[PDB]
């Protein structure tokens, strides 16, 4: 840790482009400006030292955490002053969650449509109300002081960033101490947080929620301070511990947990009152998660001769096919920030996809399962975040290979031998992509052709040539013969999706078994195909970022270059950046098909209403099994049918969704101008417009230049992603607010 590395001053605020060398000679052309924002967070190009790069990264992470805390505090303030949270808590099913009361200036007040309870605002789909009920928050003053705490935490991260960059900045070995870091982040950052939230679940969340789950009508609960001050409130709630400040923790210290089994439960399933998870199960969950994470943060050698060096583990792990195995990966992963960013972005994208696929099927918060808006929104949001982060992990893998790969570090290790048979890897992935594309999409268009022919017996359907997903069905079977079988000490299954019975909260289905048929088989192989092609593009970018048979010196050209000219037949889009650019479209395709499958299968075979007698009437009435096998059925019974809500929205509270549906169509189509053209036309057109300006003594001193080839691709893919995702967003939200 140093003392005063950087003088805190406003001098360099006045100088755009101080951080680079090409960016401080004055902007002679327009491109400089774009390059400024293109080069701002490339700390590797600013200076050429790991220490300054790491200090920059540390205090940038501080600023990002400050921004996220500002966001958190904004959410809590809007829920504490501009929402209907207490009214929603009074009547969960009858009240939809809403916040963000728009200002009534030009039309917009129609978007404050009645959500219920007299409150007038935009219906929220983020599931924040459910989060606040699940955490044990009852009134809004708790959320208000949580907003205050979020603002003060944001101020703390802001000051910590200024402090750890400008005042006391760490040295390299502090950053390179991956041992102390991993021990602090398995145990100290994850385990402590899990334990403290269990300390919020043992004492606050479970009491408040158990009282709410009987009809106590909110307000008459004591405040959460009274539940540790008075164990007399803990008397009637699970009596079977002495419940004292010394006596109550004695059963933990004496291996006496059958007493704790009343609130540390392993029930599983769903609460048949709220449609959420059993919060006793989540408390026991966080307890076990905390303990396993604190155990896990005790395996790395820091200062006391106990623990593993990651290096001994890595360089030891090696086999007869992999040469020297992992010899050299330790140097790679403590020298390249990009090699770590690749893994961490890919892993967090996979976690976000997992979070999407988990919070729909074991709905973990009270009254979010029967809030189909919230459920659809949360799944689709986490799927998009996961796809974007995965493509970013591929991007920084390519960046690592271009900039931070050293052949002397990597000799006959797994990195080197992967590079030495990239051609076999890419050719086999190419073959898998073609096979999957044929035997999924060709199946779909075969079905379209036979349905048009009037040959339904010749289709790949449940009434024609059956393709039953037998493996997924048997895994579904083994999860329901397991809340009494292979998981004996457990009340209900992991989720009702694998089997069980219709969990019916209010008049609505919370979760029912999702049976898997031929249409599911087809759309799962479509998902596998789209994932494999995205993998093919991104892995080909990562493995060929350095060289190929076409360009043997791509590492000298860099990570972000347009081409190597029209020769060799034409070498457009050879860079790793352009492979990320193509993988972004293919991620869009994959995630779009995934969320379309989710929306249709949920609306067709799970969601709906439950009659007083007990008959489920699904929203689209089970058209999935016969219409999701053709492209015509997807076009008609999913896209054409369910878009009626977003296009009939003009004149109601859903009006903004129709407006954004159209605006997103516009932005997506605006993207194609950047995607299909090239900058030469635009430079020649800017030339004549420059003539028009030069005639009137008005041509600017900063020369107007068209965007670069890479910037043209970047703008096109950004507008394409923005428009397509926002189209699907507006469609989804309008449809599921109206029918859900």
């Amino acid at each position: 840790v140093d003392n005063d590395p950087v003088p805190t001053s406003f001098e360099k605020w006045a100088k755009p482009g101080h951080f680079d060398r090409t960016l401080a000679r004055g902007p002679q052309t327009t491109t400089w400006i774009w390059n400024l924002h293109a080069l701002a967070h490339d700390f590797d190009t600013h200076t050429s030292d790991l220490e300054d790069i790491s200090r920059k990264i540390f205090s940038a992470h501080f600023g990002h955490l400050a921004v996220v805390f500002i966001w958190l505090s904004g959410m809590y303030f809007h829920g504490a002053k501009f929402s209907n949270y207490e009214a929603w808590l009074a009547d969960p099913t009858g009240i939809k969650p809403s916040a963000q009361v728009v200002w009534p200036i030009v039309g917009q007040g129609i978007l404050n449509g009645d959500v219920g309870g007299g409150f007038h605002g935009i219906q929220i789909t983020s599931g924040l109300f459910q989060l606040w009920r699940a955490s044990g928050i009852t009134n809004e003053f708790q959320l208000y002081c949580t907003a205050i705490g979020g603002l003060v935490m944001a101020g703390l991260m802001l000051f910590a960033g200024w402090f750890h960059y400008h005042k006391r900045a760490p040295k390299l070995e502090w950053f390179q101490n991956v041992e102390s870091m991993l021990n602090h982040h398995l145990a100290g950052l994850l385990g402590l947080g899990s334990l403290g939230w269990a300390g919020h679940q043992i004492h606050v969340s479970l009491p408040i929620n158990q009282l709410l789950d009987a009809g106590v009508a909110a307000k008459d609960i004591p405040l959460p301070h009274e539940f540790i001050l008075n164990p007399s409130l803990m008397a009637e709630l699970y009596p079977n511990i002495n419940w004292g400040v010394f006596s109550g923790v004695i059963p933990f210290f004496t291996f006496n947990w059958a007493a704790y089994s009343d609130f540390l439960t392993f029930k599983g399933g769903l609460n048949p009152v709220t449609g959420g998870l059993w919060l006793s199960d989540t408390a026991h969950h966080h307890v076990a998660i905390a303990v396993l994470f604190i155990i896990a943060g005790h395996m790395y050698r820091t200062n006391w001769g106990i623990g593993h060096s990651l290096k001994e583990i890595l360089e030891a792990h090696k086999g007869p096919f992999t040469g020297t195995g992992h010899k050299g990966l330790y140097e790679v992963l403590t020298t390249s920030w990009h090699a770590q960013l690749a893994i961490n972005l890919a892993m967090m994208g996979s976690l976000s996809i997992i979070v999407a696929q988990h919070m729909y099927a074991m709905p973990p918060y009270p009254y979010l399962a029967t809030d189909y808006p919230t459920q659809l929104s949360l799944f689709t949001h986490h799927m998009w975040i996961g796809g974007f982060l995965i493509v970013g992990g591929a991007a920084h893998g390519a960046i690592f290979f271009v900039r931070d790969y050293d052949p002397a570090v990597n000799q006959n290790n797994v990195l080197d031998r992967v590079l030495r048979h990239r051609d076999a890897i890419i050719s086999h992935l190419n073959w898998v992509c073609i096979f999957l594309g044929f035997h999924s999409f060709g199946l779909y268009v075969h079905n379209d052709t036979m349905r048009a022919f009037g040959r339904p017996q010749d289709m790949f359907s449940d009434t024609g040539i059956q393709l039953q997903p037998v493996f997924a069905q048997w895994v579904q079977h083994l999860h329901t013969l397991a809340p009494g079988g292979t998981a004996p000490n457990a009340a209900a299954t992991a989720s009702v999706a694998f089997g069980g019975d219709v969990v019916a909260v209010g008049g609505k289905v919370a979760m029912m078994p999702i049976a898997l048929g031929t249409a599911d088989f087809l759309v799962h192989h479509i998902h596998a195909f789209t994932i494999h092609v995205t993998v093919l593009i991104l892995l080909k970018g990562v493995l060929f970022a350095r060289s190929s048979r076409l360009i043997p010196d791509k590492a000298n050209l860099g990570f972000r270059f347009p081409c190597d000219g029209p020769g060799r037949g034409g070498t457009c889009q050879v860079s790793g950046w352009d492979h990320v650019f193509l993988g972004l479209f293919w991620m869009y395709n994959c995630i779009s098909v995934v969320i379309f499958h989710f929306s249709w299968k949920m609306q067709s075979d799970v969601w709906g209403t439950v009659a007083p007698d007990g008959t489920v009437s699904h929203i689209t009435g089970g058209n999935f099994a016969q219409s999701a096998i053709t492209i015509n059925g997807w076009l008609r019974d999913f896209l054409w049918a369910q878009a009626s809500q977003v296009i009939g929205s003009y004149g109601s509270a859903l009006s903004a969704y129709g407006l954004l549906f159209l605006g997103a169509h516009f932005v997506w189509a605006f993207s194609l101008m950047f995607l299909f053209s090239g900058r030469g036309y635009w430079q020649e057109l800017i030339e004549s417009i420059v003539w028009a300006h030069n005639k009137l003594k008005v041509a600017p001193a900063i020369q107007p230049r068209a965007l670069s080839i890479i910037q043209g691709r970047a703008v096109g893919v950004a507008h394409y992603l923005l428009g397509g995702i926002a189209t699907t967003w507006a469609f989804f939200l309008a449809r599921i607010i109206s029918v859900g």
């Binding site: 291996f255 006496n256 006391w304």
Partner: protein, 63 residues
């Protein structure tokens, strides 16, 4: 069924025996000894014995 994990002398006997077994393991496994068998080795052995005993007690009075 929710087992009979309660305060027994046998629970403490198992905990002490597991602590002794972890001390023996540390006297047979742990590579770095110049650190601190010093306090760091002793605390490590004690915590490992505690974890193994927490497993063993649950397994015994869950059987």
């Amino acid at each position: 069924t929710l087992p009979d994990t309660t305060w027994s002398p046998a629970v403490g006997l198992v905990v002490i025996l597991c602590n002794l077994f972890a001390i023996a393991i540390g006297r047979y496994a742990i590579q770095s000894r110049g650190k601190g068998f010093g306090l760091p080795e002793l605390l490590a052995t004690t915590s490992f014995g505690h974890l193994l005993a927490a497993g063993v007690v649950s397994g015994l009075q869950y059987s």
